[PDB]
Amino acid sequence: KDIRIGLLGASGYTGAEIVRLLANHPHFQVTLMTADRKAGQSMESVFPHLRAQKLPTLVSVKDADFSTVDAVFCCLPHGTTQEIIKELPTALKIVDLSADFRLRNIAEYEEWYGQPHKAVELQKEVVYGLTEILREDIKKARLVANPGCYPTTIQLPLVPLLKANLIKHENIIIDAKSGVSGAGRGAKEANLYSEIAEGISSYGVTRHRHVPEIEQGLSDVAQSKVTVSFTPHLMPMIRGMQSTIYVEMAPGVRTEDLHQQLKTSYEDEEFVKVLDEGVVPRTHNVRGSNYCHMSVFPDRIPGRAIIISVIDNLVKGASGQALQNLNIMLGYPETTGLLHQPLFP
Amino acid sequence: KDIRIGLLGASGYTGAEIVRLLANHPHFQVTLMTADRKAGQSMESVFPHLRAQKLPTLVSVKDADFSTVDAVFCCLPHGTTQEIIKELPTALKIVDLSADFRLRNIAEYEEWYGQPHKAVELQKEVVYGLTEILREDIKKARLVANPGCYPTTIQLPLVPLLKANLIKHENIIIDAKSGVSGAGRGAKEANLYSEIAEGISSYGVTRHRHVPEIEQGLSDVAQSKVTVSFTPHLMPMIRGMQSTIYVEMAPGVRTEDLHQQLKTSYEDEEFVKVLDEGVVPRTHNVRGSNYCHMSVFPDRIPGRAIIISVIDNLVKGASGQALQNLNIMLGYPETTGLLHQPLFP
Amino acid sequence: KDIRIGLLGASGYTGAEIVRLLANHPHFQVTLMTADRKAGQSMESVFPHLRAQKLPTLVSVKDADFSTVDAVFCCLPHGTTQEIIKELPTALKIVDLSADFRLRNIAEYEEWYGQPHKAVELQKEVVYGLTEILREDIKKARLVANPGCYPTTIQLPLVPLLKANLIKHENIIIDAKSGVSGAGRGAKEANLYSEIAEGISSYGVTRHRHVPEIEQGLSDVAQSKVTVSFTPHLMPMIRGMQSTIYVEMAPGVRTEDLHQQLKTSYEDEEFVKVLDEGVVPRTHNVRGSNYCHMSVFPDRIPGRAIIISVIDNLVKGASGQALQNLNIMLGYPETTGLLHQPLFP
Amino acid sequence: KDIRIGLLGASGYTGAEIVRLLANHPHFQVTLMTADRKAGQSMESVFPHLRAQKLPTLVSVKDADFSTVDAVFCCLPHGTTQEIIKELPTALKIVDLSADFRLRNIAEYEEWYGQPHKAVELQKEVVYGLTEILREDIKKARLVANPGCYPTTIQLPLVPLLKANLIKHENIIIDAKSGVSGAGRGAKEANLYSEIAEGISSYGVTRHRHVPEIEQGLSDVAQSKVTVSFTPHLMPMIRGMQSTIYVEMAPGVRTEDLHQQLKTSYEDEEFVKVLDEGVVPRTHNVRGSNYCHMSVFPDRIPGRAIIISVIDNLVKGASGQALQNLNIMLGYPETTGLLHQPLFP
Q: Do D338 and D310 contact (CB within 8 A), yes or no?
A: no
Pick from D194, D203, D205: which is nearest to C306 by CB? D205
Judge: C205–D171 Cβ closer than 8 Å, yes or no. Answer: no
| Beta-sheet pairing, D233-235 with D201-202 | antiparallel
C31 touching chain A per CB within 8 A = no
B267 to chain D nearest CA, in Å? 13
Length of chain B: 345
C340-to-B194, C343, D259 alpha-carbon distances in Å:
21, 9, 48
Alpha-carbon distance B240 to B246, whole Å?
Answer: 20
Alpha-carbon distance C315 to C321, whole Å?
Answer: 6
Judge: A285–C342 Cβ closer than 8 Å, yes or no. Answer: no
Q: Using CB atoms within 10 Å of the CB of residue C13, give its burial: 0 to 12 exposed, 13 to 18 middle, 19+ buried.
A: buried
Q: Do A75 and A14 contact (CB within 8 A), yes or no?
A: yes
Alpha helices in B56-167 (DSSP H): 81-86, 106-113, 120-123, 131-138, 149-163
Q: Which amino acid is at C210?
A: H
Query: Could you say which of C74, C75, C149, C292 is catalytic?
Result: C149
Alpha-carbon distance B339 to A9, whole Å?
Answer: 49
Report the CATH fold assignment for A1-146+314-332.
Rossmann fold (3.40.50)
Least Cα distance to B316 among B49, B74, B85, B21 occurs for B21
Length of chain A: 345
- Which residues 107-146 in chain A show a CB within 8 A of chain D? none
Pick from D181, D189, D198: which is nearest to A238 by CB? D198
What's the CA angle centered on A145, arms A143 and A146, to 5 degrees? 125
Instruction: Provide the 8-state DSSP code for C124.
Output: T
Least Cα distance to B49 among D291, D186, C223 occurs for D291
Q: Chain A to chain C, count of Cβ pairs less than 8 Å apart?
A: 83
Alpha-carbon distance A322 to A300, whole Å?
Answer: 38
Q: Where do the CATH 3.40.50.720 domains begin and end in chain D?
A: 1-146+314-332
Q: Do C292 and C156 contact (CB within 8 A), yes or no?
A: yes
Q: Which chains touch D (3 or more CB pairs under 8 A)?
A: A, B, C
C298 to chain D nearest CA, in Å? 6
| Beta-sheet pairing, C241-248 with C173-179 | antiparallel
Nearest CA in chain C to A240: C345
Alpha-carbon distance A309 to A242, whole Å?
Answer: 6
Q: Using CB atoms within 10 Å of the CB of residue B19, give its burial: 0 to 12 exposed, 13 to 18 middle, 19+ buried.
A: buried
Is residue B149 part of the annotated active site? The answer reads yes
B179 contacts in chain A (CB < 8 Å): 198
| Beta-sheet pairing, D292-298 with D233-235 | unpaired
Alpha-carbon distance D343 to B47, whole Å?
Answer: 11
| Phi, psi (degrees; rounded to nearest 5) at A311 | -155, 170
Least Cα distance to D48 among C76, A44, B289 occurs for B289
Residues of A known to be catalytic: 149
Alpha-carbon distance A87 to A99, whole Å?
Answer: 17
Question: Following CA atoms D178, D179, D182, D184 in sequence, which dihedral angle do they give, to the nearest 10 degrees?
Answer: 140
Alpha-carbon distance B285 to B341, whole Å?
Answer: 9
Least Cα distance to D307 among D341, D234, D257 occurs for D257
Alpha-carbon distance A253 to A166, whole Å?
Answer: 6
A177 contacts in chain B (CB < 8 Å): 200, 233
Alpha-carbon distance B341 to D22, whole Å?
Answer: 10
Q: Do B300 and B294 contact (CB within 8 A), yes or no?
A: no
Alpha-carbon distance A38 to B243, whole Å?
Answer: 42
Q: Which residues contact D247 (CB under 8 A, 6 or more apart)?
A: D158, D161, D167, D168, D171, D172, D173, D304, D305, D307
A198 to chain D nearest CA, in Å? 9
Pick from B24, B238, B284: which is nearest to D339 by CB? B24
Alpha-carbon distance C276 to C295, whole Å?
Answer: 7
Pick from C13, C185, C193: which is nearest to B197 by CB? C193
Q: Do A127 and A78 contact (CB within 8 A), yes or no?
A: no
- The residues with which A229 forms a beta bridge, in sequence order, are A173
Judge: A193–D189 Cβ closer than 8 Å, yes or no. Answer: no
Q: b/e map of D152-188 (b: 16 or more CB within 10 Å)?
A: bbbbbbbbbbbebebbbbebbbbbbbbbbbbbbbeee
Q: Do A293 and A281 contact (CB within 8 A), yes or no?
A: yes
Q: Which chains touch B (3 or more CB pairs under 8 A)?
A: A, C, D
Q: Where do the CATH 3.30.360.10 domains begin and end in chain A?
A: 147-313
Alpha-carbon distance A34 to A15, whole Å?
Answer: 10
- The residues with which D249 forms a beta bridge, in sequence order, are D167
Alpha helices in C58-187 (DSSP H): 81-86, 106-113, 120-123, 131-140, 149-163
Judge: B191–C194 Cβ closer than 8 Å, yes or no. Answer: yes
Reduced to 3 states, what is the DSSP secondary structure of residue D179?
strand
Q: Chain C to chain D, count of Cβ pairs less than 8 Å apart?
A: 149
Cα dihedral sign, A291-A292-A295-A296:
negative
Reduced to 3 states, what is the DSSP secondary structure of residue A46?
coil
Q: b/e map of C156-175 (b: 16 or more CB within 10 Å)?
A: bbbbbbbebebbbbebbbbb
Least Cα distance to C138 among C78, C86, C95 occurs for C95
Alpha-carbon distance B251 to B297, whole Å?
Answer: 17
C196 contacts in chain B (CB < 8 Å): 193
Side-chain-side CA neighbours of C88 within 13 Å: the count stands at 28
Pick from A237, A281, A300: which is nearest to B229 by CB? A300
B193 to chain C nearest CA, in Å? 3
Q: Do C71 and C1 contact (CB within 8 A), yes or no?
A: no
Interface test with C, best of B13, B181, B192 (most C CBs within 10 A): B192
| Beta-sheet pairing, D229-231 with D173-179 | parallel
Angle between helices A13-23 and A320-329 (to 10 degrees): 50
Alpha-carbon distance D164 to C7, whole Å?
Answer: 58
Q: Do A99 and A33 contact (CB within 8 A), yes or no?
A: no
Q: Do C287 and C343 contact (CB within 8 A), yes or no?
A: yes
Instruction: Provide the 8-state DSSP code for A167.
Output: B
Least Cα distance to D144 among D87, D83, D210, D72 occurs for D72
- The residues with which D308 forms a beta bridge, in sequence order, are D295
Least Cα distance to D319 among D51, D23, D109, D69 occurs for D23
| Beta-sheet pairing, D173-179 with D241-248 | antiparallel
Omega before B345 within 30 of 0, i.e. cis:
yes
Alpha-carbon distance A290 to A312, whole Å?
Answer: 7
- Cα D263–chain centre separation: 22
Q: Do A161 and A262 contact (CB within 8 A), yes or no?
A: yes
- Cα D130–chain centre separation: 8
Least Cα distance to B241 among B146, B130, B150, B344 occurs for B150
- C178 dihedral zone (left: phi>0; alpha: psi -120 to 50; beta): beta
Side-chain-side CA neighbours of A151 within 13 Å: the count stands at 25
Q: Do A261 and A321 contact (CB within 8 A), yes or no?
A: no
- Cα B112–chain centre separation: 19
D186 contacts in chain A (CB < 8 Å): 189
Report the first-to-last Cα separation within chain A, whole angstroms.
Answer: 34
- Give the DSSP letter string of D272-312: EEEPPTTPPP-GGGTTTTT-EEEEEEE-SSTTEEEEEEEE-
Alpha-carbon distance C315 to C164, whole Å?
Answer: 28
B201 contacts in chain C (CB < 8 Å): none
A253 touching chain B per CB within 8 A = no
Least Cα distance to A193 among A203, A180, A202 occurs for A180
A192 touching chain C per CB within 8 A = no
Alpha-carbon distance A25 to A28, whole Å?
Answer: 6
Alpha-carbon distance D279 to D262, whole Å?
Answer: 15
Q: b/e map of C86-124 (b: 16 or more CB within 10 Å)?
A: bebeeebbbbbbbbbbbbbeeebbeebbeeebbbeebbe
Q: Which residues contact D149 (CB under 8 A, 6 or more apart)?
A: D178, D182, D210, D241, D311, D313, D317, D318
Q: Do D131 and D328 contact (CB within 8 A), yes or no?
A: yes
- Cα A56–chain centre separation: 26
Experiment type? X-ray
Judge: D285–B51 Cβ closer than 8 Å, yes or no. Answer: yes
Q: State the SS3 of C177-216.
A: EEEHHHHCCCCCHHHEHHHHCCCCEECCCCCCCHHHHHHH
Pick from C13, C23, C49: which is nearest to A285 by CB? C49
Least Cα distance to B274 among B299, B297, B304 occurs for B297
Pick the CATH number of C147-313 from 3.40.50.720, 3.40.50.150, 3.30.360.10, 3.40.50.970: 3.30.360.10
Reduced to 3 states, what is the DSSP secondary structure of residue D90?
coil
In angstroms and rounded to an integer, the radius of gyration of the C-alpha atoms of chain C is: 20
- B114 dihedral zone (left: phi>0; alpha: psi -120 to 50; beta): left
Q: Which residues contact A105 (CB under 8 A, 6 or more apart)?
A: A212, A216
Alpha-carbon distance B310 to B293, whole Å?
Answer: 5
Q: Which residues contact C62 (CB under 8 A, 6 or more apart)?
A: none
In angstroms and rounded to an integer, the radius of gyration of the C-alpha atoms of chain A is: 20
Least Cα distance to D205 among D234, D183, D225 occurs for D234
Least Cα distance to C206 among C227, C189, C220, C190 occurs for C227
C283 contacts in chain D (CB < 8 Å): 199-201
Resolution to one decimal, Å: 2.2
